[PDB]
Design a protein around this ligand. Sequence first.
Ligand SMILES: O=c1[nH]c(=O)c2nn[nH]c2[nH]1
Ligand SMILES: O=c1[nH]c(=O)c2nn[nH]c2[nH]1
Ligand SMILES: O=c1[nH]c(=O)c2nn[nH]c2[nH]1
Ligand SMILES: O=c1[nH]c(=O)c2nn[nH]c2[nH]1
Ligand SMILES: [Ar]
Ligand SMILES: [Ar]
Ligand SMILES: [Ar]
Ligand SMILES: [Ar]
Ligand SMILES: [Ar]
Ligand SMILES: [Ar]
Ligand SMILES: [Ar]
Ligand SMILES: [Ar]
Ligand code: NA
Ligand code: NA
Ligand code: NA
Ligand code: NA
Lengths: 295, 295, 295, 295
Amino acid sequence: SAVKAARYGKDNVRVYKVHKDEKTGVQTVYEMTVCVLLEGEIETSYTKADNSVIVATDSIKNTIYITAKQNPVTPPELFGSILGTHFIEKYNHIHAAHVNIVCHRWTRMDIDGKPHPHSFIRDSEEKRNVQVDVVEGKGIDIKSSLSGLTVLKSTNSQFWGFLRDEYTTLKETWDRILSTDVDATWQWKNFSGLQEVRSHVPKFDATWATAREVTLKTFAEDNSASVQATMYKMAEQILARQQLIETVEYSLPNKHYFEIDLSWHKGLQNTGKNAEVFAPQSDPNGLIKCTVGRS
Amino acid sequence: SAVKAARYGKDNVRVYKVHKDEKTGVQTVYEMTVCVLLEGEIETSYTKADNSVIVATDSIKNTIYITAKQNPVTPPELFGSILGTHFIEKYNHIHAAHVNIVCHRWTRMDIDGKPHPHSFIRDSEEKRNVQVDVVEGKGIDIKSSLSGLTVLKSTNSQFWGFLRDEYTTLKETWDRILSTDVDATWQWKNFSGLQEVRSHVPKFDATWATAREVTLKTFAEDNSASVQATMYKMAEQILARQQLIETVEYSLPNKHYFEIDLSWHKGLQNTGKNAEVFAPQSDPNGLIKCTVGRS
Amino acid sequence: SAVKAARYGKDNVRVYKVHKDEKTGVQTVYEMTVCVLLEGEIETSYTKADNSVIVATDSIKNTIYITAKQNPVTPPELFGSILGTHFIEKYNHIHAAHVNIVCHRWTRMDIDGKPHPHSFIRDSEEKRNVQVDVVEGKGIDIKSSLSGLTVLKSTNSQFWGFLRDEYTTLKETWDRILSTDVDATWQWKNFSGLQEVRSHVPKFDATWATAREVTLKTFAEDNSASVQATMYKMAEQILARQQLIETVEYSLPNKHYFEIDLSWHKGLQNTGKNAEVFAPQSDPNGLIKCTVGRS
Amino acid sequence: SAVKAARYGKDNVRVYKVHKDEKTGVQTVYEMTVCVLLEGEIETSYTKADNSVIVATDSIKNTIYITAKQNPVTPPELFGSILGTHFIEKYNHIHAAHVNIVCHRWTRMDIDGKPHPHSFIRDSEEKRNVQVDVVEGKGIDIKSSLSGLTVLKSTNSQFWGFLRDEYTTLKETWDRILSTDVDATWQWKNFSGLQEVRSHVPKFDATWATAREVTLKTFAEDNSASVQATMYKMAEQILARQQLIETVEYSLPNKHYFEIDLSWHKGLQNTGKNAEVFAPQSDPNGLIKCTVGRS
Ligand SMILES: O=c1[nH]c(=O)c2nn[nH]c2[nH]1
Ligand SMILES: O=c1[nH]c(=O)c2nn[nH]c2[nH]1
Ligand SMILES: O=c1[nH]c(=O)c2nn[nH]c2[nH]1
Ligand SMILES: O=c1[nH]c(=O)c2nn[nH]c2[nH]1
Ligand SMILES: [Ar]
Ligand SMILES: [Ar]
Ligand SMILES: [Ar]
Ligand SMILES: [Ar]
Ligand SMILES: [Ar]
Ligand SMILES: [Ar]
Ligand SMILES: [Ar]
Ligand SMILES: [Ar]
Ligand code: NA
Ligand code: NA
Ligand code: NA
Ligand code: NA
C-alpha cells in the first residue's frame, strides 16, 4: 500500500487577542478557534516512522500564538493567509497549509447608552469563519462564511405546487412559519500569494457585512415560495455586490414548526387562520443547499 | 420499603406562540421549553401498578399546549402559575405542580433602521427562566432567572491578597481578564395563589430588566477585587430595587484566560503590561456562588 | 443586605491516574472530573473585598492533583472523603467541602481473547458518580450514583388504566417499547468522618455493582406496568441488599418510540402486531422520579 | 447568476426497526439516523419558484420509513443503496441520491450469563456509518466507517526525532499516553447498481468487523513511533484483508494527557518514571489524517 493523501496539525487552538489604545483607553478584544493542517513530503512519517519530516503539532500550536502576537488577527482572511504562508515558506518540504478559523462574537457593551471601553457581550453563537488553503505554486484559496445565524419569520412563507404522488402527505400551505440556521459561504477568486490578499484587505469585512445584511433583508422581505427560491435571491445579490467572489453557497435547515390540532378538546380552533400555538420540531429537518455562480 | 418522595410528568415540551395584531399587521413570537412534574397521592402507581392515579405525561403535554392556547404565555411567571394552578385545582389527588420554563430569545429584526413586523433573530443563547412550584395549601413559590449571559472585560479585574500556603502557585495580579456565564436567580415572596401572582404581573418583566441592567452595568463598571466582591454588589442593588424579592443568587464560572510567556521565542514580550495574546482555558474553571438576602 | 449562603471552588478538574504493577507489567487507569466547593467564614470575601479568607480556586485545583498523587482515587467515595476532609482539617475557617466526582469508563481491552496489560476502551458514556459533603461537626454525607446507562426493551412494557378525561388522547397499550437513560442514586447512612468511610471501603464497589446488576436484570425481566412500577422494584431490591443505604432515588426519562401508521401508503400495515418501523422521539419525554426508603 | 450545484432533502430522520422471530421469541432492534439529499433537474425551484420539480422533503421522510418497512435496514450499505436507487428510478428528473446513515448501538443484554431475547444496552456512542451516493449512469459509490471509538493506552507510545527549530518547545519522549477517537473510513470499488451491491452483502458486516478488530489490535500492540506510523499499519492491514476496498482513511485526534510537575510541593515526584497523575487536555488536540491505497 501507499499514502494517497495526508495532512496533519493542531485543531481547536483557542486564541484571544486584546488591542489597547493607550491614548483613548479603548480596548478591543478578538477571540477565535484555529486549526492548522500541513501537507508536503511527509509520507515517510506514516510509512517508515520517519519523524524528521514532522513539524510537531505542539510547534504548530506555538506558531499560531507567535503569529497572533506579531500580526493583526483581523480580518481572519488575512490572519489565515499570514499563518498559512509562514508554514510553506519556513519549511522547504511543507507544500500546503490549510487554516480554518472560527471567530467568536465579543460585542462592545453599551452602558447607559455609551459604548464601554473594555466590556463585551457574546451576542449569539453566530460565527464568522474562514478556510484559507495556502498551496505552494498555486497561491491562496479563501472561503469566507457566516454560520449559526438563527432566524424565524411568523408569516410571508409559503410552500405549494410541489410534486404529489403516493409518497406525499404534506398539505400545500399559503402561510407558514420559516426558521433556519444560516450557513452562507463566499468563495474568493484565487489570490497569487499574501501580497495579493493584503491588497484586498478592506473587502473582507465589507463582503461579510454585505452577506449578513443581504441575508437578513431578503429573509425578512421575501414572500418566500420555498427555502430554495429565497436562498437563491440572497446568493445572486451577494455576487452582484462583490466582483472578487466567484461563488456563494447556502446550506439551510428548514426548522419545522407544526400546527397543533386542538379541535378534539372543547372544539378549540388552532389550525389555519386560527393557528397561534405550534410545536417546534427538533428533528427531522429539511436541508436545502445551493452553490450560485455567474452565468 | 416505602415511597419517601415521587414526582413525574413531561419534560422538554417545546412551545411556540404567535400574537398577530390585525390592525397594525405586527406579529410577536414567543418560544419556550416547558417541564411540568406533579406530586400528590400517586405512591400506588409505584408500589401496586395502580395507573388509575396517573394523569398521563402525554395528557400533561396536551394540557401545556391547551393552556398556551387559552392564556398569555408571558410573563413566564404568570403562565407557569396558571399551568401549575390548573393541575392542583383539576385533580383532587394532585397536591403540587412544579413548572420549569426556559424562554428562548426571538428579537424583532431591524431592516433599514425600521422594526420588521414578523421577522426575528435569536440574538443570544441567553435564557430567561422560571421555576414555579404550585403547592396546594402553601401557595406559589417562584424563582426567576437569567442564564447563559456570557460577558468578558479585558481589564479592571484584580485578584490579590488571597491565602498563600504550600498548596499555592497562583501569582497575585492587579490587571487580568474576567469572563463568566451569568446565572442570576431572584426568589419572590411566597404568593397565596394565582390571584396574588396576577396582582404583581408588571413586576416580573420589570425585575428581569433590572436584574439584567444591574448585572451588565456592575460587571462593566466595577474595578473587581474578585468574582465574590462583584457578584455581591449586583445582588445588593437588585434587592434594593424590588421589595417583593427575598433573595438574589448568583452562580458564576471564572472562565480563565491565561497569559502566554513567549520569551523563549526570540525574546518576544507577551506578559504583564506586554500581554496581548492569551490562551482561553476550557477547563477547569472557578465556580463562585452566593445567596444574598435582607439584613 | 447580607450573605445567606456562599460556596466557591474549582469545577471541571480533569484527572487521570495510572497504577503500574512492576512485577506483572499490568497497568490500570482511572479518569475522573472533579468539583470541590468550600463553605466557611468567607462572607467578607463577598462583602468587604477581603481576599485574605480565600483559598484560591487555583490552589484547590493543585490540592486535587496532589491528593490524587498521595492517595488511592478509588473507590470515588473514599477519594472524595479524603479530599473533603483535607480542606476542613487544613483551614480553620473552612467548615464544609462539597466534592463531586464523575468517573469515566476505561475498560481493559481483550485482544485475541486475552486482557491487554495497558490498552483500554471507553465502552460506554455511562458514569459512576459521587457527591461527598464533608461538614465540620456533622461528618460525611455520601450520595453514590450511576448515570447515562441507556437501555431499550422492544416488548414486555405496557401502559394502560391511567386517568382518562377531556385532556387525554393517549391510547392504552399492552405492548410498547421502553427506553430510558438510568440515573440511580443511593444515599449512605451519615459517616462520623474519614475513619468510618475507610471502615466501609469494600461496600462502595459492591453496592455500585449491585445497583447496576439490579437495574439491568429488573429492566430486562419486569413485564412493566409503568416506568413508576419498574423503577420501584429496582429501588426495593437495592435497599434489601445493602443495609448501610438509607434511600435509593431513580430519575428516568421515558424516551418515546412512536408507531408509524403507513396505511395511507398502499395499505401498508405497521401498527399493533404489525408495528416494525418506529419514530424515536427526541422530545418531549416523560420524566419519572422516585425516592424509596425503609418502612 | 446561475445554479452551479444544488442538493436538498431531509436530514436527522430517526428510524427504529424491530425483527421478531415468532418461533424463538428473540427480538433484534436496529436504530439509525438518516439523511437523504437529491440532485437533478431542480435548478428552477431556486431560480423561478418552480416547486413542480421538488419531491417534498416531507415525502423523502415518508419514503425513508416506507423503505425501512419494505426492506432489511442492515447492512446499512444495502439499505442506503436501496433507498438511493428508489429516488433515481422513481423520479425521471432526479439523477443522484446521497444517503448518509448513522447506526446507533443496541447490544443485547446478558442477564445471569444468558443473552436476553428483547433487552438492549447502548454500549458506547461509537457509530457505524455509511455514505451511499447513487448517481444515475455512474452506479453506487459507498464509503463505510466506524467513528467515536474512544481508546487509551497508558504506555508503549513514543514521540521523538521530530523537527526542532526556534518554534519547538515539545520534549522528546520514549514513554507517553496515547488516546484518540477513531474515525476510520473504507471506500468501496464503484458498484454498477443495486444488483452488484446485493451480490456483495456479506462483505459489508465482515469488513466493518475486520476494520474494528485491526484498529483495536494494532492500537493495543504497536509500540507506537507516532500517531502517523500506527494509523498507517491499521490502514495497510485492512486493505490486505478486503480486495473490494480501494482506500482506507483515518482521522485521529491526539487527545493529550500532560504530566504534572508537583516538585514545587514537598518535592513530590510525578514526572518521567514517577508520572502517575496527569491532566487530560480538552483542547487543543493534534489532528492526524491519512488516506492509504494500493501501491
Ligand atoms: O504522534 C504524534 N504526532 C505528531 O505529529 C505530533 N506532534 N506533536 N506531538 C505529536 N504526536
Ligand atoms: O410509564 C409511563 N408512565 C407515565 O406516567 C406515562 N404517561 N404517559 N405514558 C407513560 N408511561
Ligand atoms: O475572582 C476570583 N475568585 C477566587 O476565589 C479565585 N481563586 N483563584 N482565582 C480567583 N479569582
Ligand atoms: O421550502 C421548502 N422546500 C422543500 O423542498 C420542502 N419540502 N417540504 N417542505 C419544504 N419546504
Ligand atoms: Ar484572536
Ligand atoms: Ar431562506
Ligand atoms: Ar410560547
Ligand atoms: Ar462578576
Ligand atoms: Ar483519576
Ligand atoms: Ar424502568
Ligand atoms: Ar432502523
Ligand atoms: Ar493511533
Ligand atoms: Na515549502
Ligand atoms: Na388537587
Ligand atoms: Na475547618
Ligand atoms: Na432519475
